Ligand binder design. Sequence first.
Ligand SMILES: CC(=O)NCc1cn[nH]c1
Ligand SMILES: [Zn+2]
Ligand SMILES: [Zn+2]
Length: 582
Amino acid sequence: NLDIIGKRIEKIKQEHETSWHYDQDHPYKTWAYHGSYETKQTASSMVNGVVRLLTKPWDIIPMVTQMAMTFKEKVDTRTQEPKEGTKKLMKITAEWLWKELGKKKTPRMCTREEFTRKVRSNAALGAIFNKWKSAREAVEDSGFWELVDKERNLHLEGKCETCVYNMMSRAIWYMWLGARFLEFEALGFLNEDHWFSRENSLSGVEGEGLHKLGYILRDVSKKEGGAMYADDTAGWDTRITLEDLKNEEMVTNHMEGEHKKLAEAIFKLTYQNKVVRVQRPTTVMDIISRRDQRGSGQVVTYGLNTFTNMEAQLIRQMEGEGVFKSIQHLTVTEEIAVKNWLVRVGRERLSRMAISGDDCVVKPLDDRFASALTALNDMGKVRKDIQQWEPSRGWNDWTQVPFCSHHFHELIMKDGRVLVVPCRNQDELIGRARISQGAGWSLRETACLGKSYAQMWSLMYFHRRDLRLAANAICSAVPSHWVPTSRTTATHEWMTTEDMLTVWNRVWIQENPWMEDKTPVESWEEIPYLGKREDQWCGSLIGLTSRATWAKNIQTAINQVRSLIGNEEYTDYMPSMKRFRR
Ligand SMILES: CC(=O)NCc1cn[nH]c1
Ligand SMILES: [Zn+2]
Ligand SMILES: [Zn+2]
């Protein structure tokens, strides 16, 4: 408790010594509360006018238009201590999993140089504004690095002064850039060196890309076994136990020297003990603490979520296969049985999964998995939207399984070759492309964000009639040479000024390990669509009068946007489609 967080608390006390008051009407039950101080401040979603002017039919679709308008009673909940048998299963599994992940990788520190390059090309490193304006400026000033050094030597001493979270089914815990650096220095290797790649982790998909996820799910479907299970957890980040955080910390067992000590300090001082500042309108700033739940940088959160989800799903698989009888207590011979299962079939069982942070798809040996719930519930990974003890419903067809907010279609090209393509309800895609985040967007910056969405649609969603047409229209409306942008950045092959047909060929043909015939596609007309009825099922407006008028008059919409942007160099991409090809 207060020996580890006291220093951080003491320091904040003094910078607001004219405001410190131990409030009596504090709303916290599961968070430890320490005091309050005076503040007064808040970033809503803005519409992208380039995308909206080129998607007129969707102006009257509420699922699209409502997306642009507008649980902290789940962050304030508590998770019970797992039973001794559960804790044993998790420790054995975690020990075995870090060794497997470490077989072909070497833990290492990430560098000021690496951190500096990241910031100088905009990655969402959840930092705060003070002394320097942006992250870009702090990184060039040697005063910052002297602050970093003071904290670093403090961490080596087993103490913390400035690693404090700022709070803001979503919850993002910003820290000052210095704290983020020290986290990246110790644990950045997990992401930077691809520990959760599919080649390295067998269950993972880190770096895989939306054009690969469908092929990965189809490969899992080819295994002998039961239904495909895709159970979502109710608020995964809030269900991370102190036992989970202790099994995650065992990655430090694979480290040495300085690194081992720096990593151990991040786990002890920032993850297993946390200090947070929250805005309350009653507007004061609350300084609260707790030991458990997830609150790291988003990128370390992704890797440790993937790790602990892989662990939980192997244990649920063990339960279905009858490897252990009860979570109350593992016998001595059950421990040897669990260890022996992992050595004998662990890697095979990992290959039966696709795991992306809190999101999973499992194809178990058989459907006993469906009612194997005791370990999963006792670890605190309670399933969303189903009663605690009600057996999971599995999917009989890999094309119906939800994963990473998508489903996947099998699409046969006129030439016989097989594409496995990502899909989701088209209102979601159009509604997201119509939204920007943040202030001070020029017309040129807004146009370049529209072009980023258009090129993503050309590469990932070319099989949706409305998106291929809207992508061609946006790319026709934005100057040919303007570079696509995004203020918050998997593999983003659409972020380029290269011709999108050349990029399509590289991604779907040349570099696609599931495509044996490498014959390049010569035109967009060789590239197929979903069936017309399937396109409507997934939200297409094909068949509506609104959509027919839009498609027929598209050059008028394109001209409207060109007239606003001004006298620039434009390309007509519409004749890449049959119906505009005269
Ligand atoms: C309709 C269109 O192409 N407008 C572009 C433009 C603006 N000024 N001169 C040409
Ligand atoms: Zn610290
Ligand atoms: Zn679909």
